[PDB]
RNA sequence: CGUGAGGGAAAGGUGAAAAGAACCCCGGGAGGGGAGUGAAAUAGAGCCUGAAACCGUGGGCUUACAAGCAGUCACGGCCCC
RNA sequence: GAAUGCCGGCAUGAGUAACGAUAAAGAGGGUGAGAAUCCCUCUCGCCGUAAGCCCAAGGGUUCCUACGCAAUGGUCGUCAG
RNA sequence: CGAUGUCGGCUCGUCGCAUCCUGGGGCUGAAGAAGGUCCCAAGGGUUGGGCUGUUCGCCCAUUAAAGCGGCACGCGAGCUGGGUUCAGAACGUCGUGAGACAGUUCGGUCUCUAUCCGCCACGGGCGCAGGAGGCUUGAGGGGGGCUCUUCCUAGUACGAGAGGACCGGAAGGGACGCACCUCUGGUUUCCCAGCUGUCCCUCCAGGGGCAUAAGCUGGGUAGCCAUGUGCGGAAGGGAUAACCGCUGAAAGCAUCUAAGCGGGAAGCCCGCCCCAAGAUGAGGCCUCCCACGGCAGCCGGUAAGGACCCGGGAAGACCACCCGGUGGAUGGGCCGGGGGUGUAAGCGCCGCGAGGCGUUGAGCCGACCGGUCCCAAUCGUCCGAGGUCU
């Protein structure tokens, strides 16, 4: 059935779904705010919050870890140098998902924004 | 004929006389008597019970006035045990003791729109030898011109589970009065955290 | 059970 | 299969009977506490950009 | 879990080696036999000039199964093959020895002479 | 409420701590209690622990042996009151966590694949010096 | 349409006169609403007349315990002249 | 008024099946009355004895620009054979 | 005949009873056991194989038993396509010939979309004279209905012996059913590890993609599961069938019956489990709101309540159901525990090296049991009684 299952499938197979999350982490950590569909947005929260948390740690293990999903050493530096300090005292919840009022025209998909918290 | 409201909590096995007895644990007690059904006013004999304290905020006005007339603080569930009139005005696990024998009623795990093989233990079709897109399909559903129709109650696919299920003659293994725990060797309907009812057995 | 085998009245359908 | 086809042309009455469940439900809307404009609930106000009492985006 | 067509090893000096179960002697329509159940079997591979020969039809009781067996004490046990022991109608072994451990469940089922002759009752 | 707490609570009375810790690969000897006809015996089952599945109180470990030409696997609950005592008889080094693969190996292959975990042997003998 | 020989349609009508609708307004356009023309603009170019099936908006009577080739005969109720 | 009639018009099925390979998408920026679909960027994926390239037949302006979006494009379109 | 697709198989059953078994009986050339035979009884059950297209039939091994029939020889808009109707080819036979044969042989297009009834599930609407939130009665339906072996009685009754009970009381199974995941056993699409070829990041080390819609391999939580586990078939009351009686005339005797009363089946009615007041005959009880403004009707604003919207959920196709919505632990994050994997990178040291050792049960780490307001359930809006008549 589906009883007590975690995480959407989002109409992608196993690698595509992982890529989907990685490229959005790349995008979200790059711009600090992105518009997407509301399902995707809610899914983005944790995948990113793990990365920010591992940034907060800072040891070499954590960076080499995050690198596997983000691949970009300049980007990861933004994560450890500029982003992570903002959260040393924040006990999780480094992302925000707000829903937007208007819809896509070509398929009425409902939209949301995902940004990083102050 | 005594009963009690309770919640299914989870299964385990213990060891009793070098034998392994698989039990399920039910947080039964305590259940305050909220109303009593008497022949004069209602027709039959039963007790309305209560479970799980509730936010007096969450409990609406007509409900509130009901609870109050009995002297009870707001509680999440009202259910009746039939042909039961306990002496006190509050029911605990201690109305059962080990060696007894119970009937347990819960809501089964809902299997949603279930197929005909899951729901009715059918046997579908072959998975080779030319069998054509019918591997999970029921088969024939009727006859021909006579009767030219389908028997009422025909076993077909549809929703299955999330229905009331009562299991009979379950050994009371142990009662933990302090923590309001009731042990019962066997399988009780429903999921953990599901509301259940524990009455004395109908069997003998 | 009909002892005398019963011959088909129709051909197996073929495209026309 | 054997190509199930319809038997009788459905009545005017009957197809409209089928469609008694087809009425759209009008959009459910609330006034924005900042700019008073009728917006969907739990959505950032699309006409002044406010949500939760603060400014969130540009409109 | 022995059932018709199951091959089994014979664990005695009856001269058989493989038997092919063809019925579980357990009531009307039993699905599988386990340790302690009789079966009717066909001898499929024997050794020359023995108690039994190829193609015989002999009863036999199953002494160890490659499916595990649960026990009331929570334990379980499974062996590395499926083995049986040939018998006469009076459930007595038709050979003189037994080869390899047998489940203690044979005692409770009354196959004493097999348990006693076994090298290890487990 | 806490359903998990309540369950761990029932499991209490039956929990043991007298048992020496062991890992897959460790050859071991279980002294187990059996009933035969009437009497009660302590029968010893001795072999390499090949799996250890945990569920807290419901944890259970499987023990592979070879008996008079037949392989015997044997499952024991780690908190059974029929288990008198367990004596480690040899520590081994498992690069794996479930050793099902040794079912298919000869003697000289298993000895080659489960060498003595000298690290834990050294600690074993370093314990037991409770002077 | 057919390789080809060869097969082989559909499709007429503003008004007397273009006087074919400047200008303004909504709209991206289409389209429409005023203004104007005209005897007439449901003659506005998708244009004489503009039937029927078919779709629709509004109104009157009626319909959610009821069995039907759908009508018909009677009676009662409501609405209209 | 019926010829499985002929011609055309319009219904039903029905907002239903389907929207043409399961190689795959995500975000930012721009244009614009309008953007999942056009352009730019970065990211991800597919082909690589091809899903790249050059000839021949055949097709016959489909080439390149500019300005367009009624229809054509299975949606959208500011884009386009 | 402007088409009613035709054997057998599979699947799903449903009914009849002229009953194969199980139950209850009479008669027996019925000692006991076991049979024969007739009557009552359709509740439930009625196995797995070898051969043949086969239905059927024989055979093997069991069994309580391996019933016979109807439903378009039930069931091709459910499946098969072995038999049999097409065209190809051959054998025997027939025919000068083309060809042909209830004679044999090898091969041979089975059609994605369900309008109406019916059926399985799920809602929306209205009604149930005031409007509401709960909790219920159960009219009437449905489901279930099986049976074996061993022991005790007792090697007793019976019998020359072999053989072997009625009744009564124990325990253990087979098949089916509902439920469940503690255990056993699966899966567990990215939860951990290992490995090859190639391209890449960043040279080393470390990593990433692709080799499937997991590249391969070893493992695996929650969940969904059976091979695993729990429990069910009853008990018991009532009325009965065949059959057996008590009392008893008509008919001084006899008669189970004509008056009356018993006993007597797995069968019928209750009883068990489940659905159910659309049971329009629309039930019952507990609690809540209550005489609001204007010309048995209308128009508003409200009451108690409800709904929309949102966070969600072992609930679920949508709908519904159930929980929560800041006065809050609902999802996400985070933290602790569990659990899986089984000792990460980094450094130090050892070896020429592939590696090895230690740090280190380390590192990573879905869902499981919990905590935590860090993030998101902001803010609100709309419907909603004034109660007809004797
Ligand atoms: Mg499923
Ligand atoms: Mg699925
Ligand atoms: Mg969850
Ligand atoms: Mg995932
Ligand atoms: Mg899909
Ligand atoms: Mg898709
Ligand atoms: Mg897609
Ligand atoms: Mg889709
Ligand atoms: Mg892949
Ligand atoms: Mg965007
Ligand atoms: Mg997580
Ligand atoms: Mg560093
Ligand atoms: Mg990671
Ligand atoms: Mg579109
Ligand atoms: Mg669009
Ligand atoms: Mg919206
Ligand atoms: Mg659980
Ligand atoms: Mg105890
Ligand atoms: Mg309940
Ligand atoms: Mg449920
Ligand atoms: Mg479900
Ligand atoms: Mg199920
Ligand atoms: Mg089922
Ligand atoms: Mg099944
Ligand atoms: Mg089957
Ligand atoms: Mg199957
Ligand atoms: Mg089958
Ligand atoms: Mg086919
Ligand atoms: Mg298939
Ligand atoms: Mg099909
Ligand atoms: Mg079918
Ligand atoms: Mg009929
Ligand atoms: Mg349901
Ligand atoms: Mg049920
Ligand atoms: Mg019992
Ligand atoms: Mg045709
Ligand atoms: Mg089909
Ligand atoms: Mg087909
Ligand atoms: Mg079709
Ligand atoms: Mg017709
Ligand atoms: Mg019609
Ligand atoms: Mg009409
Ligand atoms: Mg109409
Ligand atoms: Mg209709
Ligand atoms: Mg519809
Ligand atoms: Mg509407
Ligand atoms: Mg052997
Ligand atoms: Mg041997
Ligand atoms: Mg031979
Ligand atoms: Mg031979
Ligand atoms: Mg011995
Ligand atoms: Mg010895
Ligand atoms: Mg737990
Ligand atoms: Mg587990
Ligand atoms: Mg060994
Ligand atoms: Mg080694
Ligand atoms: Mg070591
Ligand atoms: Mg052409
Ligand atoms: Mg031609
Ligand atoms: Mg031409
Ligand atoms: Mg022609
Ligand atoms: Mg004209
Ligand atoms: Mg003219
Ligand atoms: Mg004129
Ligand atoms: Mg203008
Ligand atoms: Mg303008
Ligand atoms: Mg303008
Ligand atoms: Mg334009
Ligand atoms: Mg104009
Ligand atoms: Mg206009
Ligand atoms: Mg105009
Ligand atoms: Mg004028
Ligand atoms: Mg005009
Ligand atoms: Mg006119
Ligand atoms: Mg005119
Ligand atoms: Mg016209
Ligand atoms: Mg004229
Ligand atoms: Mg006209
Ligand atoms: Mg016209
Ligand atoms: Mg007209
Ligand atoms: Mg109208
Ligand atoms: Mg009207
Ligand atoms: Mg009428
Ligand atoms: Mg009526
Ligand atoms: Mg009426
Ligand atoms: Mg009517
Ligand atoms: Mg009639
Ligand atoms: Mg009629
Ligand atoms: Mg008519
Ligand atoms: Mg009259
Ligand atoms: Mg005529
Ligand atoms: Mg026609
Ligand atoms: Mg026709
Ligand atoms: Mg005509
Ligand atoms: Mg025509
Ligand atoms: Mg025509
Ligand atoms: Mg025309
Ligand atoms: Mg036409
Ligand atoms: Mg026509
Ligand atoms: Mg038309
Ligand atoms: Mg019409
Ligand atoms: Mg149409
Ligand atoms: Mg139709
Ligand atoms: Mg239509
Ligand atoms: Mg539509
Ligand atoms: Mg639809
Ligand atoms: Mg349809
Ligand atoms: Mg289609
Ligand atoms: Mg198509
Ligand atoms: Mg579709
Ligand atoms: Mg297609
Ligand atoms: Mg392909
Ligand atoms: Mg496609
Ligand atoms: Mg494919
Ligand atoms: Mg992106
Ligand atoms: Mg893009
Ligand atoms: Mg433009
Ligand atoms: Mg557009
Ligand atoms: Mg895009
Ligand atoms: Mg874009
Ligand atoms: Mg577009
Ligand atoms: Mg696209
Ligand atoms: Mg572009
Ligand atoms: Mg980027
Ligand atoms: Mg190449
Ligand atoms: Mg291609
Ligand atoms: Mg050319
Ligand atoms: Mg062309
Ligand atoms: Mg266009
Ligand atoms: Mg345009
Ligand atoms: Mg144009
Ligand atoms: Mg087009
Ligand atoms: Mg278009
Ligand atoms: Mg196209
Ligand atoms: Mg071009
Ligand atoms: Mg015919
Ligand atoms: Mg016809
Ligand atoms: Mg026809
Ligand atoms: Mg026809
Ligand atoms: Mg036949
Ligand atoms: Mg009879
Ligand atoms: Mg009998
Ligand atoms: Mg009988
Ligand atoms: Mg005799
Ligand atoms: Mg007798
Ligand atoms: Mg008799
Ligand atoms: Mg029957
Ligand atoms: Mg058979
Ligand atoms: Mg064979
Ligand atoms: Mg056969
Ligand atoms: Mg046959
Ligand atoms: Mg035959
Ligand atoms: Mg018999
Ligand atoms: Mg027999
Ligand atoms: Mg029949
Ligand atoms: Mg039948
Ligand atoms: Mg007939
Ligand atoms: Mg027929
Ligand atoms: Mg037939
Ligand atoms: Mg049919
Ligand atoms: Mg048929
Ligand atoms: Mg067919
Ligand atoms: Mg057929
Ligand atoms: Mg048919
Ligand atoms: Mg048909
Ligand atoms: Mg054929
Ligand atoms: Mg074929
Ligand atoms: Mg043939
Ligand atoms: Mg001749
Ligand atoms: Mg001649
Ligand atoms: Mg002649
Ligand atoms: Mg022939
Ligand atoms: Mg013939
Ligand atoms: Mg033939
Ligand atoms: Mg062939
Ligand atoms: Mg098809
Ligand atoms: Mg329909
Ligand atoms: Mg109808
Ligand atoms: Mg019909
Ligand atoms: Mg309803
Ligand atoms: Mg009333
Ligand atoms: Mg009311
Ligand atoms: Mg209510
Ligand atoms: Mg409600
Ligand atoms: Mg009830
Ligand atoms: Mg009833
Ligand atoms: Mg009824
Ligand atoms: Mg009944
Ligand atoms: Mg029964
Ligand atoms: Mg005796
Ligand atoms: Mg006696
Ligand atoms: Mg004797
Ligand atoms: Mg007895
Ligand atoms: Mg059954
Ligand atoms: Mg089931
Ligand atoms: Mg379940
Ligand atoms: Mg379950
Ligand atoms: Mg579990
Ligand atoms: Mg397991
Ligand atoms: Mg498991
Ligand atoms: Mg990961
Ligand atoms: Mg190599
Ligand atoms: Mg690689
Ligand atoms: Mg490297
Ligand atoms: Mg390394
Ligand atoms: Mg690449
Ligand atoms: Mg590639
Ligand atoms: Mg790929
Ligand atoms: Mg492969
Ligand atoms: Mg991989
Ligand atoms: Mg795997
Ligand atoms: Mg596994
Ligand atoms: Mg799992
Ligand atoms: Mg599990
Ligand atoms: Mg099972
Ligand atoms: Mg079972
Ligand atoms: Mg049972
Ligand atoms: Mg009875
Ligand atoms: Mg007498
Ligand atoms: Mg007398
Ligand atoms: Mg008498
Ligand atoms: Mg009488
Ligand atoms: Mg009587
Ligand atoms: Mg008597
Ligand atoms: Mg009686
Ligand atoms: Mg019974
Ligand atoms: Mg109920
Ligand atoms: Mg009601
Ligand atoms: Mg009710
Ligand atoms: Mg009635
Ligand atoms: Mg009425
Ligand atoms: Mg009434
Ligand atoms: Mg009433
Ligand atoms: Mg009521
Ligand atoms: Mg009543
Ligand atoms: Mg739902
Ligand atoms: Mg939902
Ligand atoms: Mg919806
Ligand atoms: Mg909704
Ligand atoms: Mg509620
Ligand atoms: Mg609520
Ligand atoms: Mg609120
Ligand atoms: Mg609320
Ligand atoms: Mg929370
Ligand atoms: Mg809570
Ligand atoms: Mg939490
Ligand atoms: Mg979630
Ligand atoms: Mg732990
Ligand atoms: Mg651990
Ligand atoms: Mg190491
Ligand atoms: Mg290391
Ligand atoms: Mg290293
Ligand atoms: Mg060195
Ligand atoms: Mg090593
Ligand atoms: Mg660990
Ligand atoms: Mg982690
Ligand atoms: Mg952890
Ligand atoms: Mg707190
Ligand atoms: Mg507001
Ligand atoms: Zn605003």
Q: What are the boundaries of each domain within chain A?
A: 14-118
CA separation for the pair E94, E85 (Å, rounded)? 8
Report the CATH architecture of A14-118. Answer: Alpha-Beta Complex (3.90)
**A6–chain B nearest CA distance, Å:** 18
Q: Is strand H in 7 Å reach of the CB of D21?
A: no
In Å, what is the separation between the CA of B168 and the C1' of G32? 77
CA separation for the pair B174, B146 (Å, rounded)? 58
CA separation for the pair B91, B199 (Å, rounded)? 12
How many Å separate Cα D4 from the centre of its chain? 35
Give distance in angstroms: CA of B144 to centre of ligand 140.
18
The strand ranges marked E within chain B are: 3-16, 19-27, 31-32, 35-37, 46-53, 75-82, 90-91, 101-107, 113-114, 158-159, 164-176, 181-185, 195-200
Cross-chain Cβ contact B181/F9 below 8 Å: yes
Given the DSSP bridges, would you call strands E16-24 and D30-31 parallel, antiparallel or unpaired?
Answer: unpaired
Handedness of CA B91, B97, B103, B104 (dihedral sign): positive
Residue of B nearest to A2 (CA): B111
Handedness of CA E53, E55, E56, E57 (dihedral sign): positive
Query: How was this model experimentally determined?
Result: X-ray
In Å, what is the separation between the CA of D11 and the C1' of G48? 38
Query: Residue F31: in which H helix or E strand, if any?
Result: strand F27-36
Measured at the alpha carbon of residue A58, what is the angle toward residues A57 and A60, in degrees to the nearest 5? 120
Q: Is strand H in 7 Å reach of the CB of D6?
A: yes
Q: A60-70 and A38-57 helices cross at what angle (nearest 10)?
A: 150
CA separation for the pair F130, A1 (Å, rounded)? 56
Give distance in angstroms: CA of F95 to centre of ligand 252.
16
Q: Which nucleotide is nearest to E23 (CA to C1')?
A: I61
Q: Which nucleotide is nearest to B193 (CA to C1')?
A: I314
Give residue for tokens 């039956």. Answer: F14
Measured at the alpha carbon of residue B52, what is the angle toward residues B49 and B57, in degrees to the nearest 5? 105
* CB atoms inside a 10 Å sphere around CB A84: 20
Give distance in angstroms: CA of E26 to centre of ligand 123.
75
In Å, what is the separation between the CA of A23 and the C1' of I329? 32
Task: Give the closest of F34, F68, F77 to E120, CB-based.
Answer: F68
The strand ranges marked E within B17-142 are: 19-27, 31-32, 35-37, 46-53, 75-82, 90-91, 101-107, 113-114
Q: Is strand I in 7 Å reach of the CB of B14?
A: no
The strand ranges marked E within F37-127 are: 39-53, 60-67, 70-77, 83-90
Half-sphere exposure of F22 (CA within 13 A, CB side): 31
* CB atoms inside a 10 Å sphere around CB B194: 17
Cross-chain Cβ contact F73/E78 below 8 Å: yes
Handedness of CA E91, E94, E96, E101 (dihedral sign): negative
Q: Is strand H in 7 Å reach of the CB of A16?
A: yes
The answer to whether F72 faces chain E, any CB pair under 8 Å, is: yes
Closest of F107, F126, F110 to residue F118, by C-alpha: F126
Task: Give the closest of F14, F79, F81 to B18, CB-based.
Answer: F81
Contact B189, B142 (CB under 8 A): no
Cross-chain Cβ contact E72/B19 below 8 Å: yes
State this model's resolution in angstroms.
3.0
Report chain D's C-alpha Rg in angstroms: 23
CA separation for the pair A13, A19 (Å, rounded)? 10
In Å, what is the separation between the CA of E11 and the C1' of I4? 65
Phi, psi of A16 (to 5 degrees): -55, -40
Alpha-carbon distances of E56 from B21, E85, E119, rounded to whole Å:
44, 14, 27
Q: Which of residues 143-182 of B touch strand I (CB under 7 A)?
A: 143-147, 149-171
Q: What token pair was written down for A5?
A: 């299952």
CA separation for the pair D19, F19 (Å, rounded)? 72
Burial class (CB in 10 A: 0-12, 13-18, 19+), B160: middle
Q: Is strand H in 7 Å reach of the CB of A106?
A: yes
CA separation for the pair A58, A83 (Å, rounded)? 12
**CB-CB neighbors (< 8 A) of B109 in chain A:** 3
């Amino acid at each position: 059935m589906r009883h007590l299952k975690s995480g959407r499938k989002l109409n992608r197979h196993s690698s595509h779904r992982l890529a989907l999350y990685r490229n959005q982490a790349k995008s979200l950590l790059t711009h600090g705010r992105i518009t997407t569909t509301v399902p995707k947005a809610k899914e983005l929260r944790g995948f990113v919050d793990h990365l920010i948390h591992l940034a907060k740690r800072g040891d070499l293990h954590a960076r080499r870890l995050v690198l596997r999903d983000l691949q970009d050493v300049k980007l990861v530096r933004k994560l450890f140098d500029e982003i992570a300090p903002r959260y040393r005292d924040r006990q999780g919840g480094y992302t925000r998902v707000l829903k937007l009022a208007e819809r896509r025209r070509g398929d009425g998909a409902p939209l949301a924004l995902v940004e990083l918290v102050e | 004929m005594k009963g009690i409201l309770g919640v299914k909590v989870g299964m385990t096995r213990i060891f009793r006389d070098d034998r392994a007895v698989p039990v399920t644990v039910i947080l039964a007690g305590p259940c305050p008597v909220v109303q009593r059904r008497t022949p004069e006013k209602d027709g039959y004999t039963a007790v309305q019970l209560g479970f799980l304290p509730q936010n007096p905020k969450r409990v609406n006005r007509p409900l509130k006035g009901h609870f109050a007339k009995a002297g009870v603080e707001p509680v999440r569930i009202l259910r009746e045990i039939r042909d039961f009139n306990p002496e006190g005005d509050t029911v605990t696990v201690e109305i059962f003791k080990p060696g007894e024998r119970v009937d347990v009623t819960g809501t089964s795990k809902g299997r949603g729109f279930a197929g005909v093989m899951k729901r009715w233990n059918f046997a579908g079709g072959p998975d080779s030898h030319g069998a054509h897109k019918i591997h999970r399909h029921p088969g024939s559903i009727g006859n021909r011109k006579t009767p030219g129709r389908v028997y009422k109650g025909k076993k077909m696919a549809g929703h299955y589970g999330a229905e009331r299920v009562t299991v009979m003659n379950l050994e009371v293994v142990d009662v933990i009065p302090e923590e309001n725990l009731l042990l019962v060797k066997g399988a009780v309907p429903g999921p953990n955290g599901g509301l259940v009812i524990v009455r004395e057995t109908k069997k003998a | 059970w009909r002892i005398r085998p019963r011959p088909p009245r129709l051909p197996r359908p073929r495209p026309r | 299969a054997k190509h199930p086809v319809p038997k009788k042309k459905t009545s005017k009455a009957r197809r409209d009977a089928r469609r008694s469940h087809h009425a759209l439900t009008p959009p459910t809307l609330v006034p924005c506490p900042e700019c008073k404009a009728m917006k969907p609930p739990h959505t950032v106000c699309p006409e002044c950009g406010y949500y939760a009492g603060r400014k969130v985006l540009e409109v | 879990m022995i059932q018709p067509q199951t091959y089994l090893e014979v664990a005695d000096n009856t001269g058989a080696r493989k038997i092919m179960c063809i019925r579980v002697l357990k009531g009307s329509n039993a699905k599988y036999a386990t340790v302690g159940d009789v079966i009717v079997a066909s001898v499929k591979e024997a050794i020359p000039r023995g108690a039994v020969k190829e193609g015989d039809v002999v009863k036999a009781v199953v002494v160890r199964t490659k499916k595990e067996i649960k026990r009331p004490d929570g334990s379980a046990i499974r062996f590395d093959d499926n083995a049986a022991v040939i018998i006469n109608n009076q459930l007595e072994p038709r050979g003189t020895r037994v080869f390899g451990p047998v489940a203690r469940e044979l005692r409770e089922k009354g196959f004493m002479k097999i348990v006693s002759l076994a090298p290890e009752v487990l | 409420m806490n359903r998990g707490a309540l369950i761990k609570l029932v499991e209490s009375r039956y929990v043991r701590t007298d048992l020496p810790e062991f890992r897959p690969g460790d050859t071991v000897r279980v002294s187990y209690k059996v009933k035969e006809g009437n009497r009660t015996r302590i029968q010893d089952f001795e072999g390499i622990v090949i799996r250890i599945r945990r569920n807290g109180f419901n944890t259970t470990f499987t023990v592979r042996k070879v008996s008079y030409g037949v392989g015997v696997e044997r499952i024991f609950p780690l908190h059974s009151p029929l288990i008198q005592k367990i004596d480690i008889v040899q520590r081994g080094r498992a690069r794996r966590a479930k050793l099902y693969f040794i079912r298919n190996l000869s003697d000289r292959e298993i000895r080659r694949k489960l060498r003595a975990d000298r690290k834990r042997i050294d600690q074993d003998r370093a314990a037991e010096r409770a002077a």
